[PDB]
Symmetry: C5
Subunit: 199 residues, 5 copies
C-alpha cells in the first residue's frame, strides 16, 4: 500500500457522518487546549478573544490499514472523516480556524486533529489587571452526542506568545457530565480554566 | 440495523426539499429560545445582539426506522433533512450559527435541531437601564409556508451567562397567525418577549 | 402528483441558467420593496443602511404542472430555479439575505421570491432631520438582460418597524428604460423613492 | 438553436480552466473601470475604498455558435466560462463583487463581464482636500499569464451623492518583468484624480 | 498536446489529497515572502497587519507531461493540485487571499503558487517609531507533515508600496526544525524577520 491507495480507500469508504462507536462503547475523545495568545480582553463586558491549538484525538477503526510495507500515517482532509461535534458552550463567536483543515491518521485508526482557532468567549475577566489575575473558564463538549456515544477527557505557556499583553499563570482542567433540561441523557464536557493577567 | 445503515438510508431517501406533511395536516413545529447571552445593547438605535439556543422540534415520518435491535437515535447533518424555513422577522443580521449543524433524529421520526445562534435584532430597548428593564420582542415563523403547511408553537436564566452585563427578568411567549399584504394565506409565528436589564 | 413528485420533476428539469422567455417576449418581472427598517443614516456621506422585503414575481411555464388532484404550490430553493439577475445600481454593499432562500411556485408557473434584504446604498440623505425629510432613490433592474429579455415593473409603513429611529413619509415608484455606453440595447429598471425622516 | 440548447452546449464543452489562445497569440483582454463611488478616503494611511464597474471583454471562440435562426447572445454564469485571472496589485482587500456573476456571450464568442466591485486600495491620497485633488493609481493585470498568453489593454456613472468628485481619469498600459519570473506581464494603470467636494 | 489536453489530464489524475513524495524523500518546498505593504501596526498590542506575496515552489512529477510540440506551462486552479499545508504559527487571523487561486505548472512538474495575502500577526512591534525600527518575525511551515514528508526552505522593498506609512529596513530568513510536545517527529519552518519602521 502506498499513500495514494490509503487516501483513496479512506475517501471511498470513510463515512464522515457515522460516529465510529465500538461495541456500543462511547468514542473516547481527548481534548486539550494549547493557548497561543490572548488578544482582546474586556473586563467591563467579560469577553475575551483567544487563540489556541485545539488538540483533539480519538480512534476510528474503520480508517485502519495494515501498515506492513506501508506508510504508518497520512494527513487527511477532515471533510473525509468523521469528526466529533465539539462546541464551546460559552463561545460568543464561531470558531475562526486559522490552519489547514487536515487530520493526521495512523494505520491503527488513531486520529489527531489540531486546528489553531481564534474565538471569543464570555467568561470571568475580573482581576485581569491584578497580581492574582483573571480566571477564564472555557467549556467544551459534544453538542449532540450524549455520554454513551461520546466521552470527553483532558489529556502551560509552552507555546504562548511572548508578545502578548498578557501572561498565563496557570491552566487547569476538569471533566463534567451534565444533564440539560432539553434531553434525558448526560453530555460530557471539559472545562479549561485559564488563569492569566495583564503584564 | 446499525448507525451506518440508518444514516445511509436517510441520506439516500430523505428529500430535504420536501415538507413532510401528513394527510394534508400542517407540520407542527415547536420553537423555544434559550437565552445564553445579551452582548451589545444600544438604547438609542433600539438594536440588540443576542445569543440563544433555538430549540426546534418537528416530526418527519419519512425518516423513521424499525428500532428493534437498532439504535434509537442518530445525529444527522441538516443538509440531509428537511428543515423548517424559520426566520426572525425583526432580525437585522443573518443568524450566525455557532454550533455544528446537526439534528438529532429518533427512530419514530421526531427531529430535534438546536443550534446556538448569535443574531442582532431591532426591538424595544427602552428602559434597559431601569429596574423594570427593557422588553425586546423577537418574532419567528416560517418564511414561505402558511398555516396549512407549517404551524408554529412554543413548547428562564437557566442557561443565561452569569458574566453578561445584563440579567433576564422574564421571558414570555405568544403565538400568532397573521395575514400579510403579499399573500392570501395566514402565516404563523411565535413572539418571544425577553424582559431584561443592565446589572 | 404529490409534493415529492413535483419537487423531483422541478429539480430534474428546471434549467436555472435558462431565462424562460415565451415566444420571444421578455420575461415580465415585478419588483416591489416593502421597507422594514432604516438602520444607519449618514447625512455627511450620503449613505443609508436599509432592510426591506424584495417582493419579486415572474412566470416560468417550464415549472408548471397539472394541479388536478395535486398541491397548488410548493416552496423551492432558488438554486433550482431560474431567477432574474436583479441588482441595485446604487448599492455600496452586497445584499445580505436575511431569510431562507426559497421561492414559492404555483402550478401554473407563477413564481414569488421575497427575500428580506439588508443593504447599504449611496443616495440623497440631505434633509433627513427636517420635516420634509430625505428622499433616498433606489434603482433596481436586470444586470445583463436588456428590455427584450426582461422587463421590470413595480406592482407604505405597513411593515415598517415602529422601533426604528426613522419614519416613512412616502414611497413612490417609477419605471425607466435606459441605454448605457457599454451596450446598444435598453435595460429596464425600477426606481423606488423612499421619503423618510428622523423621528 | 434556442437559448436552452446554447447554454447546455456551453456548459457541456466550455472548459473554464482553459485559456482560449488562438494560434499562440495572447488572448486580448480589454479592461475599463467605470467609477461609481469613493467611500472611505484616509489621507493619513493612504487607503481608499472605491466602487467601480470592471468592464472586461475578450474573445473565446470555443463559445461560438451559428446565430442563424438563433439568439445572438446569452447570459452565462462565469463559473461556466474561462475568465481572465485579473488582479489589482495595490488592492488591500479582496474584491467584493456586488452584482450577479454573469457574463454576456455573443454568438461569435465575444464575452463581456462587467461586475460592480467594491475594493480597498493602497494609493496616493495626498491632496484629496485641495483643488488639485489626489491621484490614486490602480494597477490591474493577469496574475499568472504573461504577455504571450494575455495582453491587457484599456478601451458618467459616478454618484452625485459621494463626498467626492472626479476631476479626471487616465489610463496607461505597461509590460513589466518581475524578479520571480522570466516573462513580462501586462497591466493597465488607471489614474483616478479626485477631490473632496 | 494542447493546453486543453494537459488541463484535462491534470484534472482527471492529479490527486490533490496526495503528497507527491519521491522515493520516500520529503517534498522540498521553497517559501519566500515578498512584502507589499504594512497596514496597521499596534505597538501596544504587538499586532501587525501585513500584505505579502507568498512565493511557494515545489515539484510534483505526477503533473509532468512531454513538452515536445506542447506548451511548456499552464495555469491551474489549486483545487486541482496538491498544495503544501503551510501555516503561519503566529498569525491571528486567517489568510485573506487577494489574488486568483491559480498555480503555474511547468511540463517537468515544477509548481509555482504565489498568492497575495493579507494577514495579521502577533509579533514584536516594539521600536517601530525609532530609527532601529521593529523586528517582526513570521514563522511558516507545514501544519501536519513532518520533516520526512515536507522540508521547508527559503529561496527587499522591491515591491513594497511607497505609499505605506512604513518602510522596510531589512528582511532576513532562517530555517528551523522543531519538535513539538504533541508529536514525536520534527516539523520544519522558515522564520522571516521583517525589520521595519514608521517613516518620519
Ligand atoms: C390532469 O390530471 C388529471 C387527473 O389525474 C387528468 O384527468 C387530466 O387529463 C390531466 N391532464 C393532463 C394534461 O395530464
Ligand atoms: C514526446 O513527444 C514526441 C513528439 O510527438 C515524441 O516524438 C516522443 O517519442 C515523446 N517522448 C516520450 C518520452 O514519450
Ligand atoms: C447543550 C447542548 C444543546 C444542543 O443539543 C442538541 O442539539 N442535541 C441534539 C442534544 N447539548 C445538550 C450538549
Ligand atoms: C411575511 C413573509 C413574506 C415572504 O413570503 C415568502 O417569501 N413567500 C414565498 C410567501 N411570509 C409570508 C412569512
Ligand atoms: C448597467 C449594467 C452593466 C452590466 O452589464 C452587463 O454585465 N452586461 C453583460 C450587459 N447593464 C448594462 C444593465
Ligand atoms: C507579480 C505576479 C506574481 C504572481 O505570479 C504567479 O502567480 N505566477 C503564476 C506567475 N505576477 C507575475 C503578475
Ligand atoms: C505544531 C503543529 C500542530 C498541528 O499538528 C497537526 O495538526 N498534526 C496533524 C501533527 N504541527 C505539528 C506543525
Amino acid at each position: 500500500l502506498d499513500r495514494a491507495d490509503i487516501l483513496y480507500n479512506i475517501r471511498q469508504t470513510s463515512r464522515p457522518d457515522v460516529i465510529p462507536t465500538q461495541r456500543d462503547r462511547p468514542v473516547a475523545v481527548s481534548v486539550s487546549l494549547k493557548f497561543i495568545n490572548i488578544l482582546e480582553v474586556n473586563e467591563i463586558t467579560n469577553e475575551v478573544d483567544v487563540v489556541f491549538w485545539q488538540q483533539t484525538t480519538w480512534s476510528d477503526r474503520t480508517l485502519a490499514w495494515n501498515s506492513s510495507h506501508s506508510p504508518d500515517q497520512v494527513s487527511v482532509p477532515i471533510s473525509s472523516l468523521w469528526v466529533p461535534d465539539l462546541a464551546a458552550y460559552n463561545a460568543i463567536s464561531k470558531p475562526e480556524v486559522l490552519t489547514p483543515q487536515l487530520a493526521r491518521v495512523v494505520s491503527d485508526g488513531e486520529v489527531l486533529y489540531m486546528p489553531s482557532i481564534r474565538q471569543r468567549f464570555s467568561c470571568d475577566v475580573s482581576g485581569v489587571d491584578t497580581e492574582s489575575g483573571a480566571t477564564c473558564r472555557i467549556k467544551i463538549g459534544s453538542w449532540t452526542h450524549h455520554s454513551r456515544e461520546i466521552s470527553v477527557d483532558p489529556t502551560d505557556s509552552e507555546y504562548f506568545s511572548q508578545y502578548s499583553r498578557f501572561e498565563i499563570l496557570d491552566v487547569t482542567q476538569k471533566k463534567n457530565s451534565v444533564t440539560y433540561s432539553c434531553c434525558p441523557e448526560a453530555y460530557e464536557d471539559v472545562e479549561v480554566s485559564l488563569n492569566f493577567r495583564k503584564k
